[PDB]
């Protein structure tokens, strides 16, 4: 019934709010957060399926929206469970570290920590400067395994190396093409500058 969904939604939302207020650094609490986000999405999807457009006067999203959010929550929950069973479980882990905002930032689909700004100035114009996020710790999860890799910077973009394979998750030429008349830029990644390594014409 609608009544049962309402009651479950309350307790569910209360638990989520409690996590927000606690701001825990224990990974176990973040697994519990995502498990409740996952249940909340299923509740809203069922409410919509049953023809309700609000629940306790909160908007009930369309089916497609609640399903997409559910799939995100499930993926994050299972990823954090894999990390909890790994050697990295006892590290500090914040709600921001395990947020969808971080997870979907390039490289997408990865829990990441210790982000910092890399600035790229295109063709010598201050107004034509892009800001990107690099990460010292990128957690690559495949199946039940986790490996941490370091985000690295060179003239061409931001990359990591996993199992000997170099994968760029930002390529600065993509924004050069969009914003600039040139393929010449300067990369600032914190105290030093990376300049065009090749001849210029």
């Amino acid at each position: 019934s609608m009544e049962t969904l309402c009651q479950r939604l309350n307790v569910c939302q209360d638990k989520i709010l409690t996590h927000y207020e606690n701001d825990s650094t224990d990974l176990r609490d973040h697994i519990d957060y995502w498990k409740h986000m996952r249940l909340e999405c299923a509740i809203y999807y069922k409410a919509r399926e049953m023809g309700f457009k609000h629940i306790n006067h909160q908007v009930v999203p369309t089916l497609a929206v609640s399903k997409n959010k559910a799939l995100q929550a499930i993926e994050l929950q299972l990823t954090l469970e894999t990390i909890y069973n790994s050697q990295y479980s006892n590290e500090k882990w914040t709600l921001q570290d395990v947020s969808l905002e971080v997870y979907l930032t390039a490289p997408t689909g990865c829990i990441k920590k210790h982000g910092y700004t890399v600035e790229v100035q295109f063709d010598g114009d201050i107004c034509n400067t892009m800001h990107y996020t690099n990460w010292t710790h990128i957690y690559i999860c495949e199946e039940a395994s986790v490996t941490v890799v370091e985000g690295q910077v060179d003239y061409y973009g931001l990359y990591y190396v996993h199992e000997g394979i170099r994968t760029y998750f930002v390529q600065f030429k993509d924004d050069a093409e969009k914003y600039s008349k040139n393929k010449v830029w300067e990369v600032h990644a914190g105290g030093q500058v990376i300049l065009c390594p090749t001849s210029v014409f």
């Binding site: 049962t4 996952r38 999405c41 299923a42 509740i43 069922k46 559910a70 799939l71 499930i74 299972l78």
Partner: peptide
């Protein structure tokens, strides 16, 4: 055999007794 299947499972059991 992936994540969409867990969502389907969650929806089916929403009014069933909780085991997990």
């Amino acid at each position: 055999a992936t994540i969409d299947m867990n969502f389907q499972s969650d929806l089916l059991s929403i009014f069933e007794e909780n085991l997990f």
